[PDB]
Amino acid sequence: ATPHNSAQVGDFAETVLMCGDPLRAKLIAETYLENPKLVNNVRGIQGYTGTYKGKPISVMGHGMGLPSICIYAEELYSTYKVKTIIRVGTCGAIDMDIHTRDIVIFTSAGTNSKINRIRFMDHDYPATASFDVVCALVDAAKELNIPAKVGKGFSTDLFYNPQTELAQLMNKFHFLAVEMESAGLFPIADLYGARAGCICTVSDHILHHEERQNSFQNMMKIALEAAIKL
Amino acid sequence: ATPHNSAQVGDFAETVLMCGDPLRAKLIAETYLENPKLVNNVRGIQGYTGTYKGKPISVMGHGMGLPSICIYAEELYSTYKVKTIIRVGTCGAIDMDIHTRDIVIFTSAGTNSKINRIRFMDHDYPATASFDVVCALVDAAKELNIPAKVGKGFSTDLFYNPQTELAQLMNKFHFLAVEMESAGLFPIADLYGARAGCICTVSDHILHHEERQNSFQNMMKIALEAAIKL
Amino acid sequence: ATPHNSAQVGDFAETVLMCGDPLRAKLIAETYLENPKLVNNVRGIQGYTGTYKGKPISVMGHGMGLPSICIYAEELYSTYKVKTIIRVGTCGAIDMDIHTRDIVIFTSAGTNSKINRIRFMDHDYPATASFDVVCALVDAAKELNIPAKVGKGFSTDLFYNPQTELAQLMNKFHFLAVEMESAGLFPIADLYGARAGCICTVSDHILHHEERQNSFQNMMKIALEAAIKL
Amino acid sequence: ATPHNSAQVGDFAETVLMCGDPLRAKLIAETYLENPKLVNNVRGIQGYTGTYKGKPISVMGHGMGLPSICIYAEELYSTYKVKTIIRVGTCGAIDMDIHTRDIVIFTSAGTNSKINRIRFMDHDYPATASFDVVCALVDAAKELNIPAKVGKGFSTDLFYNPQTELAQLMNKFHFLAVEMESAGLFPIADLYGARAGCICTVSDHILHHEERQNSFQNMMKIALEAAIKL
Amino acid sequence: ATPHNSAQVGDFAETVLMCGDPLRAKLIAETYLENPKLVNNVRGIQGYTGTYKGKPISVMGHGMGLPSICIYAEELYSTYKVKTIIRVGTCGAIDMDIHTRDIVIFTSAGTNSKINRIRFMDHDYPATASFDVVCALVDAAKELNIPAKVGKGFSTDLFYNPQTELAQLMNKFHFLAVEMESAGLFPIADLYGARAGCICTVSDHILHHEERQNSFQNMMKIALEAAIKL
Amino acid sequence: ATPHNSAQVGDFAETVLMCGDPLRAKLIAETYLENPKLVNNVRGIQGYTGTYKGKPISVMGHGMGLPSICIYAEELYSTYKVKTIIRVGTCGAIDMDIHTRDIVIFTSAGTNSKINRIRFMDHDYPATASFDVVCALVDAAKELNIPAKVGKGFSTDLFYNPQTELAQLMNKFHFLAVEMESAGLFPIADLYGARAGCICTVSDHILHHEERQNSFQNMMKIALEAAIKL
Ligand SMILES: O=c1[nH]cnc2c1ncn2[C@H]1C[C@H](O)[C@@H](CO)O1
Ligand SMILES: O=c1[nH]cnc2c1ncn2[C@H]1C[C@H](O)[C@@H](CO)O1
Ligand SMILES: O=c1[nH]cnc2c1ncn2[C@H]1C[C@H](O)[C@@H](CO)O1
Ligand SMILES: O=c1[nH]cnc2c1ncn2[C@H]1C[C@H](O)[C@@H](CO)O1
Ligand SMILES: O=c1[nH]cnc2c1ncn2[C@H]1C[C@H](O)[C@@H](CO)O1
Ligand SMILES: O=c1[nH]cnc2c1ncn2[C@H]1C[C@H](O)[C@@H](CO)O1
Question: How far apart are CA A44 and CA A63, in angstroms?
Answer without folding.
Answer: 10
